[PDB]
Design a binder for these strands. Structure first.
Ligand SMILES: [Mg+2]
Ligand SMILES: [Mg+2]
Ligand SMILES: [Mg+2]
Ligand SMILES: [Mg+2]
Ligand SMILES: [Mg+2]
Ligand SMILES: [Mg+2]
Ligand SMILES: [Mg+2]
Ligand SMILES: [Mg+2]
Ligand SMILES: [Mg+2]
Ligand SMILES: [Mg+2]
Ligand SMILES: [Mg+2]
Ligand SMILES: [Mg+2]
Ligand SMILES: [Mg+2]
Ligand SMILES: [Mg+2]
Ligand SMILES: [Mg+2]
Ligand SMILES: [Mg+2]
Ligand SMILES: [Zn+2]
Lengths: 24, 116, 98, 127, 155, 60, 78
RNA sequence: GGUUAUUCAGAUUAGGUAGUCGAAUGACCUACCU
RNA sequence: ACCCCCGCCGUUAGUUGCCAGCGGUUCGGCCGGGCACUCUAACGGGACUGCCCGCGAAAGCGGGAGGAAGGAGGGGACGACGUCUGGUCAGCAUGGCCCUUACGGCCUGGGCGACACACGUGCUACAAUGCCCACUACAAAGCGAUGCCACCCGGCAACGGGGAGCUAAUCGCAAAAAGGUGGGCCCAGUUCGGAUUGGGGUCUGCAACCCGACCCCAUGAAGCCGGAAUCGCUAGUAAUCGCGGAUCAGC
């Protein structure tokens, strides 16, 4: 989902990374 | 089995079943598993009885959930209620608490379109 | 050994200014690698044409901030005298570092 | 000895080194069937070699870069025609009519203002 | 448009059989320009052809189109002031185009869970004679002969 | 408050969350690029006058 | 949100500390709804402004972490 | 599903009228004009 | 039509690029070496009904070869005498009118963010050409001195702390996504859908109640591809997929 508030490409759409996304 | 006193998430994934439990979402579901070494794959129609109490009593006693949770949900309102904060008088008229556009939609809290 | 940079807007006065620098250093000193244009970093600015309101038919220009590079090896005595004196800058911002 | 040409398309160029061999085809590392995996278009690129009738008789070291995945393959398609047309005059008299020698002008088109995609207008109305 | 005949798109042949028609079907399956996703889903059902029947997908496809290829159709036309449903011969191209079109549209209607399986169960029921997509062709051929009245406007 | 506000812009006496951008010519309150200190109108006109060096009528 | 340091004006704490220093009244005319309420400042009556005027809004133990504006309407019929 | 009555909410109009058209509710089985 | 982008190649220049040729291989173009080639901009040739065929008076049209590209190859800049007494005294200037202890002037707070509605443009979806998750691979352009932040620790994360390099084809924003391999999922108001809302947190900034974004936990709303009507688009276009910037404290 492009709008699920807890997903892979969920953050790829809102400009952020978060937990569900490999940060540094 | 009858997990949270009344809710009975049978015949379905051990992980997902717990989500259906009120007060227990997806994360708190992966939480009982790693802290009880339970495999997320298996079901509820073929789990050991030990775990029917092991995993159960675990979350039941671990953190707030069930009707008691909702009560707190319902309580935190009465506080914003008795005095009249800007957040509280939103549940009154039933408006949103994000200060969002009431002019356009916002139906989800407003209710179905009442033309008049 | 030494290295000179050549940023600038006009490109006709940036193939000229880098071209004079190539003939003066070679004709009166040791080897000097030719002009090496760096990827022109260009600015772009679109903006609504109308004074008031017309979300279209707008306009936009570009800032051609060029780039050019010449590298000399031998710090000759004739060349450093040729560069110091003989040079025709203009709208070119050079920066030399050893 | 070697055969060379230059494939290019969508700013996704592709150098083409190719000396006669068994059929091995390293390109930006990886074997041919290794890099391009689960993508039907691939088996096409090697068509020029099937036009010359020499599948398992020409190794190839191609250096492709830039552009998307598939666009690459297209650049590969032409680099090989150029490669096997350079060191071979008589292999153009038949490879050209079948068509292989063309840059393929079909580049993405610039997006224009007052539109969303150089073309797709915002939902027209009147109300 | 009005000037020239505005001729067809002469697509590239098949990357497996070397025949134009095959590629055609791919496209109409292809959503969002994913020729790799569709080609597989079509090729997947190609091999689901030699399973249920040692028969070659080449003739199961050739026979799957030519068994839903509508022969004549109802086009509406004005006549100074009226809309008749004139029946008339389809374009060689129009047939293929619609056949191939409906073909796909059947794949979506079916209860089959996996796509290639839908086009598998469909492309067979096509060469057989009966199928959800074949019936949308018997159907348009009906309106054809029923309105046979107004055939006096062949134009 | 169009003069008394173009002047108040050059002041920045209080906190910097008030040093809001402003135009150099017109004193427009919005659509002021930082690279120029200009607003879209003039900066377009001045761009036609060639008085903005390097800048060039874009056409790709 | 101000996790570090509980934001609020100094004139508030000031105009209320001199209030605890001898248990004075409670009347007060503020113009800073942008401020959190000081825990101990219970029982007082801060007449908060709201573009309109000073609402004699009271205070308790519950309404602490909440701001002054929280308890001052800004719009008519709300 | 069909018929009818009404109504405003839209829709077609540059706009209005009317109509067509749509919806709701109760009952029931293209025309003119500015 | 001469203006530029992309379409063919070369001329000029070599810190972009080559186990392609040899030596080390830490088997990493890291070192040595080189610019033929990729690239980088800049200059220039190329397509002109030129050629063969046929119609024709000419103009020209239709067909074939050669060619990267044939009948403006694709795209953009450009938009006439006018029309709409179109738009803007609010970007600015300007005639006239009008205020001139306030129609001018400053702060603080409020308001443009008010909701019983209706319309316009949109995002995201209702899902098995697909939902979630582990690995792996391929872009172009663009910006980065009080800014882009590699590497290491705390944590569930947003974020913070220490700290290397960068006046920027050399350092950073930087996994391009969809996709390739493998997993659970099995048609379910669903592992679809994320609206709504309780409590806990981080960042900017005098100050996030009014009135910010952003995490994690929970709540898992409407919603089975939509009436009448109605819109975009003829090809690298529609659709579909990610990225950057301006704007800017943040948003
Ligand atoms: Mg070349
Ligand atoms: Mg595109
Ligand atoms: Mg600001
Ligand atoms: Mg109407
Ligand atoms: Mg009307
Ligand atoms: Mg009603
Ligand atoms: Mg360099
Ligand atoms: Mg060699
Ligand atoms: Mg050499
Ligand atoms: Mg023509
Ligand atoms: Mg012109
Ligand atoms: Mg007027
Ligand atoms: Mg507004
Ligand atoms: Mg439910
Ligand atoms: Mg409900
Ligand atoms: Mg930015
Ligand atoms: Zn200005």
């Amino acid at each position: 989902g492009k709008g699920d508030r807890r997903t892979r490409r969920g953050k790829i759409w809102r400009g952020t990374y978060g937990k569900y996304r490999p940060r540094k | 089995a009858r997990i949270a006193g009344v809710e009975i998430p049978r015949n379905k994934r051990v992980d997902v079943a717990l989500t259906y439990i009120y007060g227990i979402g997806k994360a708190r579901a992966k939480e009982a598993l790693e802290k009880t070494g339970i495999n997320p794959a298996t079901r509820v129609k073929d789990l050991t009885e030990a775990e029917v109490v092991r995993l159960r009593e675990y979350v039941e006693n671990t953190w707030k959930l069930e009707g008691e949770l909702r009560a707190e949900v319902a309580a935190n309102i009465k506080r914003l209620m008795d005095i009249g904060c800007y957040r509280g008088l939103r549940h009154r008229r039933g408006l949103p608490v994000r200060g969002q556009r009431t002019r356009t939609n916002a139906r989800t809290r407003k209710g179905p379109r009442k033309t008049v | 050994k030494i290295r000179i940079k050549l940023r600038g807007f006009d490109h006709k006065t940036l193939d000229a200014s880098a071209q004079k620098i190539v003939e003066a250093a070679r004709r009166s000193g040791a080897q000097v690698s030719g002009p090496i244009p760096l990827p022109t970093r260009v600015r772009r600015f679109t903006v609504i044409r109308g004074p008031f309101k017309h979300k279209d038919s707008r306009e936009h220009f570009e800032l051609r901030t060029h780039n050019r590079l010449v590298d000399i090896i031998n710090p000759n005595r004739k060349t450093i005298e040729q560069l110091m004196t003989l040079d025709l800058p203009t709208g070119v911002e050079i920066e030399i570092k050893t | 000895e070697q055969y060379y040409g230059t494939g290019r398309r969508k700013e996704a160029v592709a150098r083409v080194f190719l000396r006669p061999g068994n059929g091995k085809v390293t390109v930006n590392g990886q074997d041919f069937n290794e890099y391009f995996q689960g993508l039907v278009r691939a088996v096409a690129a090697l068509e020029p070699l099937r036009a010359v009738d020499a599948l398992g008789r020409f190794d190839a070291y191609i250096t492709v870069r830039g552009g998307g995945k598939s666009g690459q393959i297209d650049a590969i398609k032409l680099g090989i025609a150029r490669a096997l047309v350079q060191y071979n005059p008589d292999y153009r008299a038949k490879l050209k009519p079948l068509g292989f020698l063309t840059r393929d002008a079909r580049v993405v088109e610039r997006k224009k203002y007052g539109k969303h995609k150089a073309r797709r207008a915002p939902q027209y109305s009147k109300r | 448009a009005r000037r020239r005949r505005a001729e067809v798109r002469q697509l590239q042949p098949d990357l497996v059989y070397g025949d134009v028609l095959v590629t055609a079907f791919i496209n109409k399956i292809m959503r969002d320009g994913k020729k790799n996703l569709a080609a597989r889903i079509f090729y997947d059902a190609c091999k689901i052809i030699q399973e249920k029947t040692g028969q070659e997908p080449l003739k199961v496809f050739k026979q799957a189109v030519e068994n839903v290829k509508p022969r004549m159709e109802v086009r509406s036309r004005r006549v100074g002031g009226a809309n008749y449903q004139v029946p008339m011969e389809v374009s060689p191209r129009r047939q293929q185009s619609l056949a191939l079109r409906w073909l796909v549209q059947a794949a979506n209607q079916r209860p089959e869970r996996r796509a290639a399986v839908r086009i598998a169960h469909e492309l067979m029921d096509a060469a057989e004679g009966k199928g959800g997509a074949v019936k949308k062709k018997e159907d348009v051929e009906r309106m054809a002969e029923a309105n046979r009245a107004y055939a006096h406007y062949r134009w | 408050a169009r003069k008394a506000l173009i002047e108040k812009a050059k002041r920045t006496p209080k906190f910097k969350v008030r040093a809001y951008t402003r135009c150099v010519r017109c004193g427009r309150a919005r659509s002021v690029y930082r690279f120029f200190g200009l607003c879209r109108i003039c900066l377009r006109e001045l761009a036609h006058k060639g008085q903005l060096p390097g800048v060039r009528k874009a056409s790709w | 949100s101000l996790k570090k340091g509980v934001f609020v004006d100094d004139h508030l704490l000031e105009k209320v500390l001199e209030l605890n220093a001898k248990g004075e009244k409670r009347l007060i005319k503020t113009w800073s709804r942008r401020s959190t309420i000081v825990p101990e400042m219970v029982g007082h009556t801060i007449a908060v402004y709201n573009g309109k005027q000073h609402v004699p809004v009271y205070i308790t133990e519950n309404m602490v972490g909440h701001k002054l504006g929280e308890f001052a309407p800004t719009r008519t019929y709300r």
